[PDB]
Design a protein around this ligand. Structure first.
Ligand SMILES: *[C@@H]1O[C@H](CO)[C@@H](O)[C@H](O)[C@H]1NC(C)=O
Lengths: 386, 36
């Protein structure tokens, strides 16, 4: 009797943590699909979930005209001639209509009063826009290839990126800070930062295929007060209790959230052309251990239950540091806060059988109108059995 | 082959226009930077 699997409300809530089920692509590097343009197959970002805080860190030389910023226009041929190697500018698509109107960045205000845009949230509106942008081939015919997007929720600007690459390394192909000098490309990689670019949301154009779906299907926010776990031997085991978990000492919870995205086991599609389908060390939580040390628990096991812990915060590679729903994803009319509620009156303390190997048992209850789930010592005689 | 390597890490189709449902056809106002 896994309380987190006990009814329809709970199953759906929990399923929002399953990145294999709903996101289905690489996280760190999303290259999940292949698409033909002029008889060549190209890799295309494909994930269904938006990736909160992900930005692409550039390693251009620290001098004009370089700005080290992926949201700057891709470089013009002119600009490149005026700069030398490496290529300047960034990843932003710089195309215009004949009247000169930019495709990117595009103001959210123009998207919220346009009849073609059917999304309810601002983030969706931007995803949808991305979804409705396809490349044209050498015959000017629309293809099925779509560039990823970044919503800047601070500026209410939606970006389409002309560059789908997310990771370039190796001094054979790219330079760090202009070194070596003859190289075309600067190096770059995906990052999340403990302080910067939280307001940036990166996504494949396929999050806007069903633009409202990310709201109930993706783990958009950090989850305060619980630890991710898997139901096993009749109780909820949090990642601290599993063999394959990676635990690091951290200075703050933010570092842990960064780690869920940056650890070397995270779902990645980067080479050979692998497709993670979203499997990898994508889940983790910050917690304070019994001795008062702040720690991070990193795991590749999809949560199917939660252990209660008011000092803990569970994160995923997809989601934000932020623990509360922002306005740009609330409809103009999900159940993120409400699904975990109870009343003492009806939810009585139920103690599961004794896990004899650990000599603990599940206890489930209602404390402060929310479900609490922990492991307590077995009863006295029940301990005879350990 | 540099093209295979690029394709592998998500190198993009070499394209000058995109169609968007809200703005129609969208093209580069100047030549896009190419190579070395
Ligand atoms: C996560 O997603 C996949 C596909 O839906 C499923 O096979 C897997 O068992 C799920 N894991 C859960 C719910 O723990």
């Amino acid at each position: 009797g896994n309380p987190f699997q006990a009814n329809v409300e709970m199953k759906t809530f929990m399923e929002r943590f399953n990145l294999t089920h709903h996101h289905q692509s690489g996280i760190y590097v999303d290259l999940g699909q292949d698409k033909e343009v002029d008889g060549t197959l190209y890799r295309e970002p494909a994930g269904l979930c938006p990736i909160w805080g992900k930005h692409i860190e550039l390693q251009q030389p620290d001098r004009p005209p370089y700005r080290n910023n992926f949201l700057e226009d891709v470089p013009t041929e002119k600009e490149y001639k005026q700069s030398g190697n490496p290529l300047p500018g960034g990843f932003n698509l710089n195309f215009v209509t004949p009247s000169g109107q930019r495709i990117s960045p595009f103001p959210m205000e123009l998207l919220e009063k346009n009849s073609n845009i059917k999304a309810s949230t601002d983030l969706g509106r931007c995803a949808e826009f991305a979804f409705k942008t396809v490349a044209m081939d050498k015959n000017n015919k629309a293809t099925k290839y779509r560039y990823p997007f970044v919503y800047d929720s601070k500026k209410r600007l939606c970006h389409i990126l002309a560059v789908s690459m997310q990771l370039m390394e190796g001094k054979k192909y790219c330079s760090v800070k202009g070194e070596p000098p003859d190289l075309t490309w600067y190096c770059f990689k995906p990052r999340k930062s403990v302080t910067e670019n939280h307001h940036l949301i990166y996504g494949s154009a396929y999050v806007g295929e069903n633009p409202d779906a990310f709201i109930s299907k993706c783990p958009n926010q950090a989850l305060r007060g619980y630890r991710f776990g898997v139901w096993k031997k009749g109780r909820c085991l949090d990642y601290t209790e599993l063999t394959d978990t990676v635990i690091e000492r951290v200075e703050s919870k933010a570092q842990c959230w960064v780690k869920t995205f940056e650890n070397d086991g995270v779902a990645s599609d980067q080479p050979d052309q692998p497709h993670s389908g979203g499997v990898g060390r994508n889940y983790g939580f910050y917690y304070v251990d019994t001795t008062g040390e702040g720690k991070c628990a990193l795991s590749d096991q999809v949560p199917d239950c939660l252990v209660s812990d008011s000092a803990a915060v569970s994160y995923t590679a997809a989601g934000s540091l932020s623990e509360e729903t922002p306005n740009f994803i609330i409809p103009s009319n999900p159940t993120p806060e409400t699904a975990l509620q109870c009343t003492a009156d009806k939810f009585p303390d139920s103690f599961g059988a004794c896990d004899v190997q650990a000599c603990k048992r599940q206890k489930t209850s209602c404390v402060g109108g929310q479900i609490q789930s922990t492991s307590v010592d077995c009863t006295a005689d029940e301990q005879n059995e350990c | 082959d540099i093209v295979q390597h690029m394709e592998d890490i998500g190198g993009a189709p070499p394209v000058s226009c995109v169609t968007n449902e809200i703005l129609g056809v969208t093209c580069a106002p100047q030549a896009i930077a190419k190579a070395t």
